[PDB]
Scaffold this active site. Structure first.
Site, PDB file in Angstrom:
ATOM      1  CB  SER A   1     -78.401  -1.174  44.089  1.00 11.96           C
ATOM      2  OG  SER A   1     -79.211  -2.112  43.342  1.00 11.96           O
TER       3      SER A   1
ATOM      4  CB  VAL B   1     -76.230  -1.565  39.840  1.00 11.41           C
ATOM      5  CG1 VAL B   1     -75.025  -0.886  39.257  1.00 11.41           C
ATOM      6  CG2 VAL B   1     -76.980  -0.548  40.789  1.00 11.41           C
TER       7      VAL B   1
END
Ligand SMILES: COc1ccccc1/C(=C\C(=O)C(=O)O)SC[C@H](NC(=O)CC[C@H](N)C(=O)O)C(=O)NCC(=O)O
Ligand SMILES: COc1ccccc1/C(=C\C(=O)C(=O)O)SC[C@H](NC(=O)CC[C@H](N)C(=O)O)C(=O)NCC(=O)O
Lengths: 203, 203
Positions: free
Chosen positions: A11, A168
């Site tokens: 991410s 996330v």
């Protein structure tokens, strides 16, 4: 003061959040509890099964722009790696020991994958990271393929799902949960309110 | 100075963005070009066909919290309406005339639907809005069901898709596009940079 941080090394918004959280740690002594978890599993758990933003070119094109805007605000590079195969490095987080070395692992891996664009499944990346951290390469690499390592990663992913984490980067302070690098300003404001109460500047 | 604003009245993040943009208009004389568009159509256009965040309870539960946090920052109520059937009121935006009345329509409708939680397909809402704006209720209601009204809404939706808009709220200044109420701080910084250049405070 303690913040729980939930991230997946795939991410780029987590890369940005980790940079800003690490500065809070180093500039203000904030304590971070790190949790590497499987985004793919958390998404499927809450029913988020549609095409990912990774697979929607027009939105990804904009997200790439947003990511550069934040990297410029933060003064750091952000370079896309060739793939998002973060499982090995996520698992490898569970080799790290106490806080300094846990933060050091997370920093070095995020800087490699999203600061330099190194593929997270590069076969030599565990050795490169070991060299940086002063770890035994062979012991780390054995840990990465071990059953106990996968179990710990699965345990933490499951605990995050139980905690209502759906993505996330996710941060908790107390009972408050924020999702996104772009909500760290609210976590920072909550921390300040607690700093003031504890200092008797506020009831 | 001109900002293009793209919204759908179903969107609570658009309600928040409109409040902050309206204050910039009234406090700083910023000019807003309003565009009511069909989110559902823009999503399907870029391939975003998975379950919506509306339909993912665990994420919606958090988004509801995020929405209240922003409403508190902005000092405004935010109340979910019973449904998201915004087509009629989106179309009705194209009855409004010059800038004051276009902004007034957008403000009154957003305040009704997301400030008070009034369903956007309430059968009496066109009359209520007409009364507020000084419009002829019967002429407005006839406009809402007319072919020319749908065509204008479809025309603007299509133009937004051509412009690479994939969601709402979306804002442009020049060639820069931001998506989200939580990116208005970047639009505000770009506006300030242009204010400074134009004032010869910066090259
Ligand atoms: C490699 O992932 C990637 C690349 C480029 C842009 C985004 C992403 C995201 C993941 C992705 O597309 C999936 O695999 O689903 S990063 C994870 C998501 N985080 C955010 O989008 C945070 C956005 C913020 N506004 C912020 O931090 O500024 C994520 O948690 N997705 C879950 C979801 O429900 O959207
Ligand atoms: C009624 O819609 C609704 C209710 C509650 C929470 C969100 C929404 C969104 C739309 C929705 O679920 C769909 O119908 O898809 S509002 C439209 C979306 N905007 C945002 O999520 C902005 C988020 C920001 N971080 C911000 O403004 O803070 C949207 O454009 N969805 C498109 C997409 O690609 O996600």
């Amino acid at each position: 003061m303690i913040v729980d941080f939930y991230f997946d090394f795939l991410s780029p918004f987590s890369y940005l959040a980790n940079q800003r959280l690490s500065k809070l740690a180093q500039d203000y002594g904030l304590t971070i509890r790190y949790n590497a978890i499987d985004l793919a599993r958390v998404k499927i758990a809450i029913g988020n099964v549609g095409p990912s933003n990774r697979d929607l070119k027009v939105k990804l094109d904009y997200l790439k722009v947003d990511l550069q805007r934040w990297a410029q605000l933060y003064g750091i590079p952000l370079v896309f790696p060739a793939n998002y195969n973060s499982r090995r490095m996520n698992i490898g987080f569970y080799y790290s020991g106490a806080e300094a070395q846990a933060a050091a692992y997370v920093n070095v891996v995020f800087n490699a994958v999203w600061g330099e664009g190194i593929a997270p499944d590069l076969e030599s990346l565990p050795a490169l990271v070991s060299e940086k951290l002063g770890w035994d390469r062979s012991a780390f690499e054995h840990f990465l393929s071990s059953n106990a390592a996968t179990e710990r990663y699965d345990e933490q992913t499951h605990a995050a799902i139980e905690r209502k984490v759906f993505g996330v980067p996710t941060m908790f302070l107390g009972d408050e949960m924020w999702w996104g690098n772009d909500r760290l300003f609210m976590l920072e404001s909550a921390m300040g309110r607690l700093c003031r109460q504890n200092a008797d500047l506020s009831s």
